[PDB]
Structure 1
Amino acid sequence: GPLGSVLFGSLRGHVVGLRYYTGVVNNNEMVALQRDPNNPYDKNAIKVNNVNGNQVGHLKKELAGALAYIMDNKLAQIEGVVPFGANNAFTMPLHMTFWGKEENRKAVSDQLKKHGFKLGP
């Protein structure tokens, strides 16, 4: 994880919107999360891009509705890997790891819990 950061934990979620983008992913490959704040459908949007810099999709809206605050306030840095399903039609799984400063670790977990998510090992 990033130099000087604590592992907060992990979450399994999904990339969606795959039919609308040309970015490809390989199984077991890293992806990049990027805030998408001017998306005209959802101000909390977070896009998922592949390592080369091509959009793959979006985080599911409910997860983005929890994570936008975390990204905007820089409470965690989030890493993503697609474990399998890279050629799925509609949705693919995403393993996310959350990293940051100890002083923000409970704030991140509390934000997630407010939206029905929880970190695990």
Structure 2
Amino acid sequence: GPGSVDSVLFGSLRGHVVGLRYYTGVVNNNEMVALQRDPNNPYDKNAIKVNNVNGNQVGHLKKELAGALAYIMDNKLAQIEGVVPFGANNAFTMPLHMTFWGKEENRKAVSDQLKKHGFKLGPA
């Protein structure tokens, strides 16, 4: 979502969009994608949809990553921008580059949540 004007860069994380065979949303390399929570997903309450900029679903975040990010999105600790760098025509999974922005005071809370699930932000 839109970040506050005092939002700053927290760091980056690499992950994957999965479930591609079940959706038809098209994305190309170097394009933004949207991360969108789907708490009513009957298979995973932590589900995060990945949509293209026109609104069409591309796939889901891998459930292990969703299990970490769900808390961060739900409590608005950071806004997360997704970009597909390569592999946008892949049949089953594609890489995702995620950039985290947020208020300085929320920086530690984000990093701590990621560490809990075995993730860590990389450099700017």
Q: Hey, what's the Cα distance between the residues in 1 that align with 2:103 and 2:10?
A: 9
Deviations 1:16-75 (A, max 9, x none): 000000100011100000001000000000000000110000000000000000000000
What runs of 5+ residues in structure 1 fail to find an aligned partner?
none
Name the SS of the counterpart of 1:25 in structure 2: coil
TM-score (structure 1 length as normaliser): 0.97
Shift of residue 2 of structure 1?
6.0
TM-score (structure 2 length as normaliser): 0.95
| Divergent runs of 4+, >2 A | 1-4
- The alignment's C-alpha RMSD in Å is 1.0
Q: Is the 8 A contact 1:2 1:99 kept in 2?
A: no
**Matched residues, number:** 121
Alignment of 1:1-121 (within 5 A): 3-121=5-123
Q: Is the 8 A contact 1:76 1:108 kept in 2?
A: yes
Shift of residue 3 of structure 1?
3.1
Cα 1:12–1:120 shift into 2, 3 Å? same
Give the % identical residues.
Answer: 98
Q: Hey, what's the Cα distance between the residues in 2 that align with 1:46 and 1:94?
A: 13
Q: Hey, what's the Cα distance between the residues in 2 that align with 1:83 and 1:97?
A: 13
Query: Quick check: 1-10 or 53-62, which moved more?
Result: 1-10
Q: Is the 8 A contact 1:22 1:54 kept in 2?
A: yes
